[PDB]
Amino acid sequence: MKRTWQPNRRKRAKTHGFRARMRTPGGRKVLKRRRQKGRWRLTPAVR
Amino acid sequence: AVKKFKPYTPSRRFMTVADFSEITKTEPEKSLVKPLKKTGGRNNQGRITVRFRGGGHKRLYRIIDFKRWDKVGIPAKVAAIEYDPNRSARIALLHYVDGEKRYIIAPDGLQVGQQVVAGPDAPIQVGNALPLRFIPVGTVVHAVELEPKKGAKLARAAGTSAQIQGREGDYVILRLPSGELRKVHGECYATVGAVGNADHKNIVLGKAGRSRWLGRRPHVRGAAMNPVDHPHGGGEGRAPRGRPPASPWGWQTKGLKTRKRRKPSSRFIIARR
RNA sequence: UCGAUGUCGGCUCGUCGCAUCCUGGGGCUGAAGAAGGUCCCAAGGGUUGGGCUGUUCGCCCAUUAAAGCGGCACGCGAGCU
RNA sequence: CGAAUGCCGGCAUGAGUAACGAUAAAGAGGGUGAGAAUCCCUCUCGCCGUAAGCCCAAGGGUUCCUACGCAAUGGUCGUCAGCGUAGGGUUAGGCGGGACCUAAGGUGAAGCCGAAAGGCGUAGCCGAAGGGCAGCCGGUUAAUAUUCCGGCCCUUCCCGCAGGUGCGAUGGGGGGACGCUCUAGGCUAGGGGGACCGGAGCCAUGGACGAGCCCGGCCAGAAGCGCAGGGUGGGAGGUAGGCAAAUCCGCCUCCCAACAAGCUCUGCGUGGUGGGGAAGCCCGUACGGGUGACAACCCCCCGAAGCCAGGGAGCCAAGAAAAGCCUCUAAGCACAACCUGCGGGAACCCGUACCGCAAACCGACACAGGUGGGCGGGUGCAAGAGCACUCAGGCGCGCGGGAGAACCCUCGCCAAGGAACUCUGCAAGUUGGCCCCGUAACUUCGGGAGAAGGGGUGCUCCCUGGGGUGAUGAGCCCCGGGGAGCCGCAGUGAACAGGCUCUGGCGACUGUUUACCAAAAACACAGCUCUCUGCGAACUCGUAAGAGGAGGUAUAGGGAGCGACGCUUGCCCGGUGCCGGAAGGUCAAGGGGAGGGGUGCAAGCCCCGAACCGAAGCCCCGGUGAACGGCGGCCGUAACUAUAACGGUCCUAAGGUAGCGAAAUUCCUUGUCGGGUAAGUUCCGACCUGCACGAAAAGCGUAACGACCGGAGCGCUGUCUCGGCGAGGGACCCGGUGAAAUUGAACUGGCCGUGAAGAUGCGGCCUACCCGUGGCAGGACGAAAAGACCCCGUGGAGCUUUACUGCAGC
RNA sequence: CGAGCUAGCCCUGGCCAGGGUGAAGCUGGGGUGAGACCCAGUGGAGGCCCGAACCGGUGGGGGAUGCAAACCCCUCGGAUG
RNA sequence: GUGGUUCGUGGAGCCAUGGGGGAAUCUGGGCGGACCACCGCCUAAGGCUAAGUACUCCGGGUGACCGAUAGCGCACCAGUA
RNA sequence: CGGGGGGAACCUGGGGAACUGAAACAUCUCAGUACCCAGAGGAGAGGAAAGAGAAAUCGACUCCCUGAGUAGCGGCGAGCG
RNA sequence: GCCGAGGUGGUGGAAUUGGUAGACACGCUACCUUGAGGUGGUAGUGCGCUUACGGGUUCAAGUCCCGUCCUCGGUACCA
RNA sequence: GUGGGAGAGGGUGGUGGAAUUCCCGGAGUAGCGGUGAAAUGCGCAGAUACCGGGAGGAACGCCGAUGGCGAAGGCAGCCACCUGGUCCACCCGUGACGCUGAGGCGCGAAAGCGUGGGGAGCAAACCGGAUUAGAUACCCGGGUAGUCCACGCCCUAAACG
Ligand SMILES: [Mg+2]
Ligand SMILES: [Mg+2]
Ligand SMILES: [Mg+2]
Ligand SMILES: [Mg+2]
Ligand SMILES: [Mg+2]
Ligand SMILES: [Mg+2]
Ligand SMILES: [Mg+2]
Ligand SMILES: [Mg+2]
Ligand SMILES: [Mg+2]
Ligand SMILES: [Mg+2]
Ligand SMILES: [Mg+2]
Ligand SMILES: [Mg+2]
Ligand SMILES: [Mg+2]
Ligand SMILES: [Mg+2]
Ligand SMILES: [Mg+2]
Ligand SMILES: [Mg+2]
Ligand SMILES: [Mg+2]
Ligand SMILES: [Mg+2]
Ligand SMILES: [Mg+2]
Ligand SMILES: [Mg+2]
Ligand SMILES: [Mg+2]
Ligand SMILES: [Mg+2]
Ligand SMILES: [Mg+2]
Ligand SMILES: [Mg+2]
Ligand SMILES: [Mg+2]
Ligand SMILES: [Mg+2]
Ligand SMILES: [Mg+2]
Ligand SMILES: [Mg+2]
Ligand SMILES: [Mg+2]
Ligand SMILES: [Mg+2]
Ligand SMILES: [Mg+2]
Ligand SMILES: [Mg+2]
Ligand SMILES: [Mg+2]
Ligand SMILES: [Mg+2]
Ligand SMILES: [Mg+2]
Ligand SMILES: [Mg+2]
Ligand SMILES: [Mg+2]
Ligand SMILES: [Mg+2]
Ligand SMILES: [Mg+2]
Ligand SMILES: [Mg+2]
Ligand SMILES: [Mg+2]
Ligand SMILES: [Mg+2]
Ligand SMILES: [Mg+2]
Ligand SMILES: [Mg+2]
Ligand SMILES: [Mg+2]
Ligand SMILES: [Mg+2]
Ligand SMILES: [Mg+2]
Ligand SMILES: [Mg+2]
Ligand SMILES: [Mg+2]
Ligand SMILES: [Mg+2]
Ligand SMILES: [Mg+2]
Ligand SMILES: [Mg+2]
Ligand SMILES: [Mg+2]
Ligand SMILES: [Mg+2]
Ligand SMILES: [Mg+2]
Ligand SMILES: [Mg+2]
Ligand SMILES: [Mg+2]
Ligand SMILES: [Mg+2]
Ligand SMILES: [Mg+2]
Ligand SMILES: [Mg+2]
Ligand SMILES: [Mg+2]
Ligand SMILES: [Mg+2]
Ligand SMILES: [Mg+2]
Ligand SMILES: [Mg+2]
Ligand SMILES: [Mg+2]
Ligand SMILES: [Mg+2]
Ligand SMILES: [Mg+2]
Ligand SMILES: [Mg+2]
Ligand SMILES: [Mg+2]
Ligand SMILES: [Mg+2]
Ligand SMILES: [Mg+2]
Ligand SMILES: [Mg+2]
Ligand SMILES: [Mg+2]
Ligand SMILES: [Mg+2]
Ligand SMILES: [Mg+2]
Ligand SMILES: [Mg+2]
Ligand SMILES: [Mg+2]
Ligand SMILES: [Mg+2]
Ligand SMILES: [Mg+2]
Ligand SMILES: [Mg+2]
Ligand SMILES: [Mg+2]
Ligand SMILES: [Mg+2]
Ligand SMILES: [Mg+2]
Ligand SMILES: [Mg+2]
Ligand SMILES: [Mg+2]
Ligand SMILES: [Mg+2]
Ligand SMILES: [Mg+2]
Ligand SMILES: [Mg+2]
Ligand SMILES: [Mg+2]
Ligand SMILES: [Mg+2]
Ligand SMILES: [Mg+2]
Ligand SMILES: [Mg+2]
Ligand SMILES: [Mg+2]
Ligand SMILES: [Mg+2]
Ligand SMILES: [Mg+2]
Ligand SMILES: [Mg+2]
Ligand SMILES: [Mg+2]
Ligand SMILES: [Mg+2]
Ligand SMILES: [Mg+2]
Ligand SMILES: [Mg+2]
Ligand SMILES: [Mg+2]
Ligand SMILES: [Mg+2]
Ligand SMILES: [Mg+2]
Ligand SMILES: [Mg+2]
Ligand SMILES: [Mg+2]
Ligand SMILES: [Mg+2]
Ligand SMILES: [Mg+2]
Ligand SMILES: [Mg+2]
Ligand SMILES: [Mg+2]
Ligand SMILES: [Mg+2]
Ligand SMILES: [Mg+2]
Ligand SMILES: [Mg+2]
Ligand SMILES: [Mg+2]
Ligand SMILES: [Mg+2]
Ligand SMILES: [Mg+2]
Ligand SMILES: [Mg+2]
Ligand SMILES: [Mg+2]
Ligand SMILES: [Mg+2]
Ligand SMILES: [Mg+2]
Ligand SMILES: [Mg+2]
Ligand SMILES: [Mg+2]
Ligand SMILES: [Mg+2]
Ligand SMILES: [Mg+2]
Ligand SMILES: [Mg+2]
Ligand SMILES: [Mg+2]
Ligand SMILES: [Mg+2]
Ligand SMILES: [Mg+2]
Ligand SMILES: [Mg+2]
Ligand SMILES: [Mg+2]
Ligand SMILES: [Mg+2]
Ligand SMILES: [Mg+2]
Ligand SMILES: [Mg+2]
Ligand SMILES: [Mg+2]
Ligand SMILES: [Mg+2]
Ligand SMILES: [Mg+2]
Ligand SMILES: [Mg+2]
Ligand SMILES: [Mg+2]
Ligand SMILES: [Mg+2]
Ligand SMILES: [Mg+2]
Ligand SMILES: [Mg+2]
Ligand SMILES: [Mg+2]
Ligand SMILES: [Mg+2]
Ligand SMILES: [Mg+2]
Ligand SMILES: [Mg+2]
Ligand SMILES: [Mg+2]
Ligand SMILES: [Mg+2]
Ligand SMILES: [Mg+2]
Ligand SMILES: [Mg+2]
Ligand SMILES: [Mg+2]
Ligand SMILES: [Mg+2]
Ligand SMILES: [Mg+2]
Ligand SMILES: [Mg+2]
Ligand SMILES: [Mg+2]
Ligand SMILES: [Mg+2]
Ligand SMILES: [Mg+2]
Ligand SMILES: [Mg+2]
Ligand SMILES: [Mg+2]
Ligand SMILES: [Mg+2]
Ligand SMILES: [Mg+2]
Ligand SMILES: [Mg+2]
Ligand SMILES: [Mg+2]
Ligand SMILES: [Mg+2]
Ligand SMILES: [Mg+2]
Ligand SMILES: [Mg+2]
Ligand SMILES: [Mg+2]
Ligand SMILES: [Mg+2]
Ligand SMILES: [Mg+2]
Ligand SMILES: [Mg+2]
Ligand SMILES: [Mg+2]
Ligand SMILES: [Mg+2]
Ligand SMILES: [Mg+2]
Ligand SMILES: [Mg+2]
Ligand SMILES: [Mg+2]
Ligand SMILES: [Mg+2]
Ligand SMILES: [Mg+2]
Ligand SMILES: [Mg+2]
Ligand SMILES: [Mg+2]
Ligand SMILES: [Mg+2]
Ligand SMILES: [Mg+2]
Ligand SMILES: [Mg+2]
Ligand SMILES: [Mg+2]
Ligand SMILES: [Mg+2]
Ligand SMILES: [Mg+2]
Ligand SMILES: [Mg+2]
Ligand SMILES: [Mg+2]
Ligand SMILES: [Mg+2]
Ligand SMILES: [Mg+2]
Ligand SMILES: [Mg+2]
Ligand SMILES: [Mg+2]
Ligand SMILES: [Mg+2]
Ligand SMILES: [Mg+2]
């Protein structure tokens, strides 16, 4: 029966992607946080 | 005037559709339509600010002429009488002699081929529009300006009209379709007669779906909610309001007056609804 | 026993007590005979099918030798409902 | 450290136990190989076939192809693989996206707003599965192909020549450009049949050399032409509108065709050319290749939901935008510029493998679940995407072998009985398609209705009617009719396919709902009523700007109740709410300063303060019931009795009208009486003692409707008396793989006691060789979950209000 | 930080085999002073009817360390709104 | 009307300021805890100003600091699987 | 010519909680803490008296010790200081 | 079973410890009006005993209290 | 047929003054109303009585008659339009074309019904004041349907001469 993951590449960049993060102050801090934690990926893969 | 139906289904029992006899033209004037945005009752924040809305037919908006005074003295001939999905009334298409086409909201008694004109001149006749100061007292008139040059505001709804009761100073005394008594400024235009499609109030929706077509979604009662939701929610089997009845926002809904009292236009009012 | 001892009734399967409903054997009788009445011995066996109600019970229809009363966590839900 | 349902790790028990993931199904031969049920090829068998085949889009991202491999992954095996290593493989001016357009929405110069962060916003910009745009058929690779090759067509851009013309745009106009149902004529895809055309081969096992049988009889294709269809008036004159201008468009007037007549566009046909091309036999292909052939390449018929397409009609709920495109003119320029035609050159970026109803996507899994579009053949059955078999193609579901116990699941049948079963006919069974006959109460006249209940149903022969396509004719297709007869238990001969009736309650109705224990009498609903709201509306969201309401205007909009329809909806305004009320009273800041104090030599500085004026609010006066709400008690009385039409009296703001009533409400209660039944706590009809109905939290009714809940009948049945037999998948045995909760440690019996009150573990007594298999559930107060009930905690949270205190709002 | 599940709304597209019933209108006839009306044909309306796809989730059985953290079978509801 | 200060409205000054009123330039103005007098202090409504102080991404030194269940989450291609 | 953005922690400014404490709870506390935002740097704030406040006194600002849990503040409670 | 208010004239109904045939009505009795009844007018309701029972408090008890009987009202929930 | 006559005969659209009622304004004060007598009610929050301004609905005084018209029910300010019946005159035309009328059809006071409107005065029901043994009546103060318009029903009557 239909589950919660319905991959849509466009949705994923548009929602969690880089420009999206940088648009908002909250999001700039996500990036700020992740970058400082040393994540290998600041933002999901998508494509 | 008001089609009825044999009961070949339930709800086809009580249904009533308007009579479309007055309708001359079956498709609108391309020149005069813009598309309109259906809101769903959602304001700029994507929030619902008017409940129970949405659905209902795609609809083209007809741009209709609520100032007759740009065309002063230019006559016009009534070309057709049309269906406007955006309003209770009917729109007339009319051709000005100098070649402009405009929609007037159709007075009752107006027929196709009639000659029509607005200005401080002009006969007193159906469809003509004049400054309020120049209509003979006792006339019945529709599409009335409330402030000079601001657009027609009062009595645009199918079958409504208003009446000149008398003149005092720069202002004239109007009886509104509400029965309110109002001074309007003399300079305000109005066009003589009533709105027509008066048979409008007798149409019987007749089935649930037909209320949806009009883009009005089901209306759920306070009583039938819970207390997180309404002042009337909760209470086992039914129960009565058990408080003076109220809106979801919890103000009183029976007889409590909401007009601002200190409103400046009070100086201009004499009556009620 | 609350770091859990599932709770009425029905079905299923029973087993036990006797303070015995019936059948066996008795005393007395206000026992002629037949039929009973009471109390005595006796637990081997037996103790129907339906209407109504979730019902236990109970009332009722039709029969019966008779249509017993109790206990078993008001026997029995790692057996069913 | 020994305990914390401790934390981390390791290893046990259960146990060689349960399971090995759809009951579509397998058998053998041959090959390969250390090793074969499990890989390969053959033959047989079975399964899908509106799919379990094929294409596309998502998403996945090397899984594709091939060589060499088998540790692990594969629920067994593995020589196999979607697995390991390596190599290879995705080719476009025309297909999809982008150097095009705009939708919601997003963003956003101007602008507005907000402590900051930020919010909003016109133009513009971004944004597509919509609009616009130029490629069709075949061949070829192990693996790509509208991409490469072959053949036939087409687009833009740049430059040139020729010919034409006031050229020219981000500006004006036209167009683009539209719903839903139904649908005409012509086509096409697709399909069926042919005695005609082409073709290897065949005569079995009784018969057939036959107008035998099995196979095939097309595809694409510029200009031209043909057929069907779309779109479209032509000239003049005036002209004040389309924010400049216009010869355009609009508007008025006059004259011509009324018609596709013409002009124009698209569909199909045909087309120069080009291309395919079966069964079968043979070659070994892992898969194709050769041949059939020099193939034939035609006729008839059925016929879209597709095409002509802006087609037609009806209807109300009244049906995107922008650009491409055409037109008009402005500056500007007129050697320019644009139009048309021919030529040459120029034509970029990204995607393309493969999976794709699934072992490759979402579900931790090679998971019986989920996933949008298209195509989806044949026969029969009324039709059909239904159902049975079947083509192309694709599968036998990645553990097997046996045995033929109990038990379980799924299935078939049963003597007599026929609901006795049981909370309940739950379940199952009966009925079942189509044609004809027929069909009640009641009804809102539509319905009720498939009411009910009946008859027919195959095949062969004769006669026979009408249609469609062909011509007005055969042939082919479709719809019938009448007569005589054949066979079986039975002809919708298998498969898909209502059991019916009477009667209450509730809800008018189709709808909606607690994703995952409730689908309902709940919600919704048309409709009725109340109320607010004059428009910068009320009201909602926001601190605001703004926004919805609404580009709406009282026949409109918000809030609240009630809930189709019929007949109706009583009395109380004391309290509460709301509404009205220019007086009165009280009322905060402020005003006012009578008087009083502090200090100073004082001039003064500073403090207090009465009268009096001073809002809303409350008080007060009224109104208000489809506002919140409420709608009595006791005593007596009639010429039998009984009951009380009648009277008395206390209290109230007023004392429940109609109608209904043991009710979805009645406690007593199985009330009482009637009906039903052999028997009826339920059901139905009454009565009225209504514990505790009652009129829009509406009262009483109501045809139609209901997977709702009562009650009764018929029909029919393994529901039952009461069970029996049979089938398959498990369970059992063998080979492979091999879990789980639980587990203080165990050398773990019965009775009577005892014990923290229910003992395998204490006492006495009885019984008892050791160890397993298959079964059953009485016990281990068996497992599971730090009982949800109950209490406790000065634990929490959601909800209410005339609790307290705040805040928004007004 | 989330509306890639779910709920509502907005924009743009798509889907719904087949069969049945036969409203208004129209046409003709009847009727009449003219009508209302009646009949016949035609016509093809509807939160109309039966029923696949699609959407559900009614009753029962199975499953309950499952094929599955909601499934399977039979049955059932809607199916131009 | 509030904030700051030890100051919670208290006898509540000082510093700051959202609102109303609104001066003077040394004989001017603020302050010394309501206010008044006296005696003192100090010169608001412009601005800048090292050092002494805080911290440790980084380099070094040193430990009655740990020694791979410790010590950073990471001794190991970890903010990875 | 400059701005933009980043930086472990540290600094300043704008804004600013609750659990908790008071053995309930509103003033009070936790606390101008957590956190959000703007700015600055190698530091940042502050800084040269309209200061203190009792002596006829001290002289800018920071930082440490101390004064001192004092003076005071406070449902004169808990507590703050 | 459990808490709240009650029991008084013939009837319905009153009363702060100070009674009293006992408010106020209506019954009723005597007379009057009427031809007669009713309505209506005039003036009285026990034989020197009682305010449900009987037993305390007080100087005094229908009043306050103690239990007993009866009424009415409310209640018996999770279980 | 021709020529004339009277009339509230009918339908549609207009339109006038009187009076009631409500609102504003002005002036003005203590009572107005109401009855058999009173009370309820209205009034110092300024009523009543008076003047002015306006809104609105209904009914049409005198003419007016024991009159006119109509088949009936019924019809009454004025004006216009459309229309019915009817009488008189001259003696012109058709040539018994007549009378009646079961059924059918139409019309039909008031009240009542439906859907809209409209609503001043009046007023079933209903509330209150009185009266009365009582009064669910008569009288008084309030008062909703209704009375009015349109469309559609209902179809009755002491629809009577
Ligand atoms: Mg779905
Ligand atoms: Mg997941
Ligand atoms: Mg996408
Ligand atoms: Mg890296
Ligand atoms: Mg937004
Ligand atoms: Mg509702
Ligand atoms: Mg609810
Ligand atoms: Mg909420
Ligand atoms: Mg609430
Ligand atoms: Mg409530
Ligand atoms: Mg209730
Ligand atoms: Mg409720
Ligand atoms: Mg317990
Ligand atoms: Mg335990
Ligand atoms: Mg347990
Ligand atoms: Mg014995
Ligand atoms: Mg004997
Ligand atoms: Mg004897
Ligand atoms: Mg005898
Ligand atoms: Mg015995
Ligand atoms: Mg026995
Ligand atoms: Mg029995
Ligand atoms: Mg029963
Ligand atoms: Mg009983
Ligand atoms: Mg019992
Ligand atoms: Mg038991
Ligand atoms: Mg049980
Ligand atoms: Mg455990
Ligand atoms: Mg441990
Ligand atoms: Mg083991
Ligand atoms: Mg075992
Ligand atoms: Mg086993
Ligand atoms: Mg097994
Ligand atoms: Mg072999
Ligand atoms: Mg094999
Ligand atoms: Mg098929
Ligand atoms: Mg992809
Ligand atoms: Mg994956
Ligand atoms: Mg790989
Ligand atoms: Mg491939
Ligand atoms: Mg492969
Ligand atoms: Mg392997
Ligand atoms: Mg393996
Ligand atoms: Mg590989
Ligand atoms: Mg370019
Ligand atoms: Mg764009
Ligand atoms: Mg924005
Ligand atoms: Mg800006
Ligand atoms: Mg901004
Ligand atoms: Mg596109
Ligand atoms: Mg496209
Ligand atoms: Mg293209
Ligand atoms: Mg082509
Ligand atoms: Mg190809
Ligand atoms: Mg151009
Ligand atoms: Mg032979
Ligand atoms: Mg061709
Ligand atoms: Mg112009
Ligand atoms: Mg068109
Ligand atoms: Mg068309
Ligand atoms: Mg553009
Ligand atoms: Mg031009
Ligand atoms: Mg020029
Ligand atoms: Mg070229
Ligand atoms: Mg490709
Ligand atoms: Mg599938
Ligand atoms: Mg696959
Ligand atoms: Mg598998
Ligand atoms: Mg699967
Ligand atoms: Mg998967
Ligand atoms: Mg699907
Ligand atoms: Mg097909
Ligand atoms: Mg069929
Ligand atoms: Mg098809
Ligand atoms: Mg099928
Ligand atoms: Mg095959
Ligand atoms: Mg197999
Ligand atoms: Mg398998
Ligand atoms: Mg048989
Ligand atoms: Mg049988
Ligand atoms: Mg039989
Ligand atoms: Mg039978
Ligand atoms: Mg029984
Ligand atoms: Mg059943
Ligand atoms: Mg009948
Ligand atoms: Mg019936
Ligand atoms: Mg019928
Ligand atoms: Mg039948
Ligand atoms: Mg036959
Ligand atoms: Mg046969
Ligand atoms: Mg059959
Ligand atoms: Mg079958
Ligand atoms: Mg069948
Ligand atoms: Mg059926
Ligand atoms: Mg009932
Ligand atoms: Mg329903
Ligand atoms: Mg009802
Ligand atoms: Mg339904
Ligand atoms: Mg619900
Ligand atoms: Mg549910
Ligand atoms: Mg739930
Ligand atoms: Mg349902
Ligand atoms: Mg359910
Ligand atoms: Mg606005
Ligand atoms: Mg606000
Ligand atoms: Mg707006
Ligand atoms: Mg708008
Ligand atoms: Mg309701
Ligand atoms: Mg109801
Ligand atoms: Mg009241
Ligand atoms: Mg009140
Ligand atoms: Mg009042
Ligand atoms: Mg006052
Ligand atoms: Mg003052
Ligand atoms: Mg002094
Ligand atoms: Mg006041
Ligand atoms: Mg009052
Ligand atoms: Mg009422
Ligand atoms: Mg009484
Ligand atoms: Mg009652
Ligand atoms: Mg009755
Ligand atoms: Mg009763
Ligand atoms: Mg009964
Ligand atoms: Mg009751
Ligand atoms: Mg009954
Ligand atoms: Mg009720
Ligand atoms: Mg009510
Ligand atoms: Mg009822
Ligand atoms: Mg249902
Ligand atoms: Mg059986
Ligand atoms: Mg078997
Ligand atoms: Mg042993
Ligand atoms: Mg024991
Ligand atoms: Mg021992
Ligand atoms: Mg065993
Ligand atoms: Mg056991
Ligand atoms: Mg147990
Ligand atoms: Mg516990
Ligand atoms: Mg407490
Ligand atoms: Mg608490
Ligand atoms: Mg969504
Ligand atoms: Mg339907
Ligand atoms: Mg259906
Ligand atoms: Mg189900
Ligand atoms: Mg089970
Ligand atoms: Mg729709
Ligand atoms: Mg403070
Ligand atoms: Mg204080
Ligand atoms: Mg202070
Ligand atoms: Mg001072
Ligand atoms: Mg200030
Ligand atoms: Mg100062
Ligand atoms: Mg000082
Ligand atoms: Mg100083
Ligand atoms: Mg420094
Ligand atoms: Mg370091
Ligand atoms: Mg280690
Ligand atoms: Mg470590
Ligand atoms: Mg070690
Ligand atoms: Mg280790
Ligand atoms: Mg670690
Ligand atoms: Mg590393
Ligand atoms: Mg910075
Ligand atoms: Mg700060
Ligand atoms: Mg701060
Ligand atoms: Mg700031
Ligand atoms: Mg505390
Ligand atoms: Mg505490
Ligand atoms: Mg607490
Ligand atoms: Mg603080
Ligand atoms: Mg430095
Ligand atoms: Mg430094
Ligand atoms: Mg510095
Ligand atoms: Mg500095
Ligand atoms: Mg500074
Ligand atoms: Mg110094
Ligand atoms: Mg003190
Ligand atoms: Mg503090
Ligand atoms: Mg006499
Ligand atoms: Mg006495
Ligand atoms: Mg005494
Ligand atoms: Mg409770
Ligand atoms: Mg007369
Ligand atoms: Mg007459
Ligand atoms: Mg006349
Ligand atoms: Mg003659
Ligand atoms: Mg009548
Ligand atoms: Mg009438
Ligand atoms: Mg009398
Ligand atoms: Mg009156
Ligand atoms: Mg008469």
Author numbering:
A (entry chain P8): 1 to 47
B (entry chain 11): 2 to 274
Question: Which passages does the manuscript contain on this structure?
Answer:
Our models suggest an advanced mechanism of decoding that, for the first time, describes how a missense error can skip discrimination, leading to translational infidelity. Our data provide evidence that steric complementarity and shape acceptance but not the number of hydrogen bonds between the decoding centre and a codon–anticodon duplex play the discriminatory role during decoding.
Further analysis showed that the codon–anticodon duplexes containing G·U mismatches have an overall geometry that is identical to that of the corresponding cognate duplexes consisting of standard Watson–Crick pairs. Although the 3 Å resolution of our models is not sufficient to distinguish between the two tautomeric forms, the observed Watson–Crick-like geometries for the G·U pairs can be rationalized by the presence of enol tautomers in the P-site. In an analogous fashion to the mRNA P/A-kink131420, the mRNA constraints between the E-codon and P-codon1114 together with the tight ribosome grip surrounding the tRNA anticodon stem-loop1214 contribute to the fixing of the P-site codon–anticodon mini-helix in place. Thus, this fixation would restrain the first codon nucleotide from the shift necessary to form a wobble pair.
